[PDB]
């Protein structure tokens, strides 16, 4: 039964391909789980090499040939947008679920029987999750806790030294933009910038915005105290006669004097801007004046400002012009002709930083900036790529915890407890089927791929570390007390994740199990591979 | 490079159950099934066999083919050994086992494709066998009464000769029935003493002529000539016959006994000595009234001179089997020595003469209306080498089948020409339908195999099976005036070669099979089929 | 080049069997998945039997004929896509040994298959049970069979309302010795036509008795309800009348230009006077209406609808009875549209419509679907079609057949009873259908995960000795009664399934040669 230009893969070979391929993809990502995982180098073939641990980047850019591995990788990518994390967790769960299922399928267990067992265990796992979770305080003054969350999301993906730098950066950046009111939380209020020529350790939190173009006159202040902000969309470059004209003169000195008269077209605008300061805290102590002009400013116009200790910046990007109106409170003027004292915004220190190749202007200390900036430092695209991923994900991690009060103690306590729960609940209930109970046991065992992989990557023997966690967990239950018991990846013994500070997202773990269950089921239910036209 | 799993014994490629060893084994058997399939029936096909010694024969007999084939594949050996079972203690059924056993395997494969295990299939076949064997007991119409009448013998001998030689059935039947009626005693209801060994009837053939001049001799026919001067005995009764194993010459000496001559007188003295000693031995034979002498060895010149002068017919019989058979004609006991054929060891023959059969002269030891031999000889003629040789085999089959008429109800007669096989299909199917569970699957397919006989009988006759088979089934699937079928127990395959249509009544030609042959074939065929099915792997090893 | 004799027979059956295998996993609620490997780097896991057959290339023309079987089935009824393909393949497989091993001429094979079809059709009827198609609550329970296990399960009350009321309206429920017997002919594709209007929600949808027109009107403010409706259907526009022959107008004095303008106004009025003379209440014209004509007619006490194609005017004529007249001047007083409930010109979703809803049922209706977005409108429509297909299949025959493989097994057993009574060579290919039918209860067991022999044998035994309502439990895999576990399907599907499956097999079996040429 074969048509030319077609193939029908039968005799359970489709299952053998699906499981073998999944074990391949598992083997790749299994080496990168937890803070003890490895780094991968991704070579684009053009000479640019990316360094990352991020599962989303790894699966997105890594070339995959196995059609089955493509299915799992893309399905995980779908969960990445839904959950914001858990990429490796899903792939590891899918792989082990298929491995455990395959061992039973070889023994005569129908793929559907296992699949139904997976669905039962999944539903029971979600019930456990509901009793496992801890309800966090709704207080936004939980900084001491959110620091632990930032460390949990950062430490996994950084060199553990950068963690000390980024932890307060992620934590305070989101708390700054998170209104302490039952309103909302938008992590897009924290901008992600990158700069070269500094070590990654120098990643810094900036309360306001940063602009690229600086001043181009040596006498303008590099530090403006309690600045007023003018937002101006019109050029102050040397202007010419409005209409076609020329210089008609009799004596050489008249040539430049006539040009000086032509200069009046722009000088009149300069005077109005200088008078603007004179009207609004002209000579008041501890007051300044900065201009963030979207368009150019003549070197002569800058000299006019420099003489008055005014910091006149030029050729700002629109993106910052619109934000700075919200940050500083001032209004943009399309022309100096509309200039008025009610236009100016207000901010604290405006600082010009100069480095070898570039200048940067800082607009910090605003009354209500409604925006923050994080500056990611590095010497090469290696540190810049890794740090950027760490910051973007850390901001999301602490954002999800602030939005969703449900927190899950980590260190493997969730998945190890699920194994114990499902093992006992299954034998205690046996309400599935004489055969289906096989799939439930396969599901419960597969869940342990996560705590086992976390330990293996640490160099500790999973055979001893998991046993020690199970022992203390059982002792707590026999003692009739509630205790969260997880893995200490540095000592090798058990720990309490709620004292150590190891926290997982409620939403990620909820969907990670549900997704991995569906992905493994979709492959276990595949009886034949059908190829045509290739 | 290419890896292989499961092959760890001397590197053999040995297929497992999951690899279809049973299906592959059956496929090998199918090659022999087709070879034997075209043999059965009065219109069976001939085969040419070229013996490695440079001898070419033609036969219809499947067993001959199977013995002449070098059978290697164990899957076929199971059925070939089953064929030998039909030859041991039975004179027929060779084609029935080879054909039925193959078909049972063929329908088994149809069940295997379903996912029905070899164990489940074999179990069903064993049940259907036991049912089949019981049902056959009730299909008996007549019975041979073992009165050994020529006419009762012909009823059985005729269908036995048929399917080995067609068109000469009546001529060969008379030849076998006559010879059988000669050796069989006149008796009724006597089963304590066995009698009628197959060896009691010899068949002799000469090239040339045709069966139109065939006959039966009451006695033995030898291919040796009367070496002595007397070529025939007189017309008197009870000629005394002496039989010797010692050559008819001067006695030898156990140790040395070499005569050396140095003087002319010694030559004369030893020459006279030997001549006198031989005469004394030949004289003592003649003095006992012996008129014919049979030697198991050669005869010296002097012995011929004396035996001629005594008027004693000198006939050489070198075959130990012919001498043993001669004891069943004249009664003489071969003398281990020479010159003392004690009268008690002498036999009696009424006539010893030379006869011309086919142009070849033979010597015949026979009796006519008296001192009647316990052996018979059937005389065949034919000009065509291949045809005459096969006719000889047809004679042997007739005699062997008569031996099949044995004390344990061997005379039970069932309608032939496939009529029994058709009725079995209906009865076995009902057994399947009444059997719960998966067992019905193999029991029904067991019945299916039995249509191969009315199919084969039709195919060999040139008939379209697609018209004959539904006509045969309709002929037995009829409405009768009562639960028990009568007129339509006799509808069989009409081996005519005609054009239009129809079936023929067994009663028209008295085509009956022996129950003992049928029930035996049913046992052997099933054991052969189930044996092959039980083998899911073949492994070779040094023993 | 060519395949002759047994080469065509083997090739045709071989290809068809391969097609059947593709979809054997598609049967039942526990259908398994297949991996479709594209010539590109993608892969599709969709387990829809239609999509699987569509998206997989086939080589042998016989396989293409199998694809056409599924396409025909999809047009006839709303289901059976995989049944006709699996069954037809098995019928060919069962006929295979008869063409080869028994050497039975294809002519014999085809004759028996036609007889087996006739008997199979009888049995499907005999094992079926009636339902009162006039009991709306009973119908709702049947329609939900095609709505559940879907996101829109929570719409099922409204989906049943829309499907049931529309199909009942169009059903040609009539019989007589003069105008003939439509025999409850239902054609939802032409008669139940569905329109999607932005705005509202699924709960706001309505079945209308009349025509839903998407064209706008000459003025938004006109009478919406009429006591004695009279409807005019015209092709010709209302504009300046011109002659067919040559006309030459020469103007010297500017004063005569006004006279020409007055004539132009009169000619438009004269067209409107002929329309107004017959006291209309709604005027529909395919071509446009001049600004003067718009006021000339409205002031006469009627509404005017413009830009309505002949295709729509034919629909309007069926529900009004108005005759279409080409030239305006020829309009007759016999053109009426009375007993019409409304001429509503409501703007819905910022779009103008015109509704001719009436108290008539002239073998037609329109479904009006509401929804807050185009996605909602499409989601309602796409899922509603399933409900309407079932409503058609049920209202076309009150007999329901048992599911779970029960009907197919009943045909197998009953055919076996008749096979024993069939004389002649045809007995063999006759059995072929009896055995082939069991591919359905066999496949259901395999997809459930049970023993395909032990459970199938028990199922057959239950039908052989007991009732014909015994089937396979899709979820448990156990043998259960189909009344306790209702899995009943309209007879219409089962009758067409066995009919087209055997006929398709016959089309391939009777071809003993495929030759190339153009």
Swiss-Prot record, chain A:
Pfam families for this protein: Cpn60_TCP1
SUPFAM superfamilies noted in UniProt: GroEL apical domain-like, GroEL equatorial domain-like, GroEL-intermediate domain like
Keywords recorded for this protein, A-Z: Acetylation, ATP-binding, Chaperone, Cytoplasm, Nucleotide-binding, Phosphoprotein
Source domain of life: Eukaryota
Molecular function as annotated in GO: ATP binding; ATP hydrolysis activity; ATP-dependent protein folding chaperone; unfolded protein binding
GO CC terms in record: chaperonin-containing T-complex
Record-annotated disulphide pairs: none
GO BP annotations listed: chaperone mediated protein folding independent of cofactor; protein folding
Subcellular location: Cytoplasm
Residues bearing the modification Phosphoserine: 245
Family: Belongs to the TCP-1 chaperonin family.
Quaternary state and interactors: Heterooligomeric complex of about 850 to 900 kDa that forms two stacked rings, 12 to 16 nm in diameter.
NCBIfam families, per database record: chap_CCT_zeta
Function: Molecular chaperone; assists the folding of proteins upon ATP hydrolysis. Known to play a role, in vitro, in the folding of actin and tubulin. In yeast may play a role in mitotic spindle formation.
Name used for this protein in its record: T-complex protein 1 subunit zeta
Record organism: Saccharomyces cerevisiae (strain ATCC 204508 / S288c) (Baker's yeast)
Curated annotation (Swiss-Prot), chain B:
GO molecular function list: ATP binding; ATP hydrolysis activity; ATP-dependent protein folding chaperone; unfolded protein binding
The organism's place on the tree of life at top rank: Eukaryota
Position(s), cross-link Glycyl lysine isopeptide (Lys-Gly) (interchain with G-Cter in ubiquitin): 9
GO biological process: chaperone mediated protein folding independent of cofactor; protein folding
Record has GTP-binding as a keyword: no
A GO-annotated cellular component: cytoplasm
Modified residues (Phosphoserine): 499
Keyword list, A-Z: ATP-binding, Chaperone, Cytoplasm, Isopeptide bond, Nucleotide-binding, Phosphoprotein, Ubl conjugation
Pfam families linked: Cpn60_TCP1
Intracellular or extracellular location(s): Cytoplasm
Signal peptide: none
Record family assignment: Belongs to the TCP-1 chaperonin family.
Subunit structure: Heterooligomeric complex of about 850 to 900 kDa that forms two stacked rings, 12 to 16 nm in diameter.
Role played: Molecular chaperone; assists the folding of proteins upon ATP hydrolysis. Known to play a role, in vitro, in the folding of actin and tubulin. In yeast may play a role in mitotic spindle formation.
Name of the protein described by the UniProt record: T-complex protein 1 subunit theta
Protein species of origin: Saccharomyces cerevisiae (strain ATCC 204508 / S288c) (Baker's yeast)
Gene: CCT8
Swiss-Prot record, chain C:
Pfam families: Cpn60_TCP1
Classification via Gene3D superfamilies: GroEL (3.50.7.10), GroEL-like equatorial domain (1.10.560.10), TCP-1-like chaperonin intermediate domain (3.30.260.10)
Covalent S-S links between cysteines: 359-365
Protein localization: Cytoplasm
Keyword Acetylation found: yes
GO molecular function list: ATP binding; ATP hydrolysis activity; ATP-dependent protein folding chaperone; unfolded protein binding
Alphabetical UniProt keywords: Acetylation, ATP-binding, Chaperone, Cytoplasm, Disulfide bond, Nucleotide-binding, Phosphoprotein
CDD domains noted in UniProt: TCP1_gamma
Keyword check for DNA-binding: no
TM region positions: none
Residues in coiled coil: none
Modified-residue entries (Phosphoserine), positions: 245
A cellular component annotation (GO) from this entry: chaperonin-containing T-complex
One GO-annotated biological process of the protein: chaperone mediated protein folding independent of cofactor
Function of the molecule: Molecular chaperone; assists the folding of proteins upon ATP hydrolysis. Known to play a role, in vitro, in the folding of actin and tubulin. In yeast may play a role in mitotic spindle formation.
Quaternary structure, from the entry: Heterooligomeric complex of about 850 to 900 kDa that forms two stacked rings, 12 to 16 nm in diameter.
Protein family membership: Belongs to the TCP-1 chaperonin family.
Listed name of the protein: T-complex protein 1 subunit gamma
Provenance organism: Saccharomyces cerevisiae (strain ATCC 204508 / S288c) (Baker's yeast)
